[PDB]
Design a protein around this ligand. Structure first.
Ligand code: CA
Ligand code: CA
Ligand code: CA
Lengths: 48, 82
């Protein structure tokens, strides 16, 4: 086998992820969106 | 008057200095002009003071935070050109 690397003499083969060479663009999961909010949780109250 | 966005959006006189205290600058921001900054902000709570033209005999008016200046011409003077 070749996959395991050996540190006796720097034995390790050149590797590359396959997705880089060929992509499989499924898309994404763009369902229920996300949001950011004020640090106190209330935007602006109005004295009443 | 003041908020995270009340003083972050566009400066408009039809927004900040009108319905609260209008302490300062928000009457100067809209115009970028320190000339009528304190000759108009005195007229936010109690109403105007020179609209009556207390100075007669063709005398101009000047508004101060409590008292009124009446400029009367050569040989004319007075607290209200009086
Ligand atoms: Ca406002
Ligand atoms: Ca302003
Ligand atoms: Ca303002």
């Amino acid at each position: 086998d070749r996959t395991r690397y050996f540190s006796m003499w720097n034995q390790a083969v050149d590797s590359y992820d396959p997705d880089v060479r060929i992509i499989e663009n499924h898309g994404t999961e763009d369902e229920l969106p996300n949001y950011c909010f004020p640090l106190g949780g209330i935007g602006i109250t109005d004295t009443f | 008057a003041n908020s995270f966005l009340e003083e972050m959006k566009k400066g408009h006189l039809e927004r900040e200095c009108m319905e609260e205290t209008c302490s300062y600058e928000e009457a100067r921001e809209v115009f970028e002009d320190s000339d009528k900054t304190n000759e108009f902000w005195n007229k936010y709570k109690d109403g105007d003071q020179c609209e009556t033209s207390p100075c007669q005999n063709q005398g101009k008016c000047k508004d101060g935070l409590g008292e009124y200046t009446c400029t009367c011409l050569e040989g004319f003077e007075g607290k209200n050109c009086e």
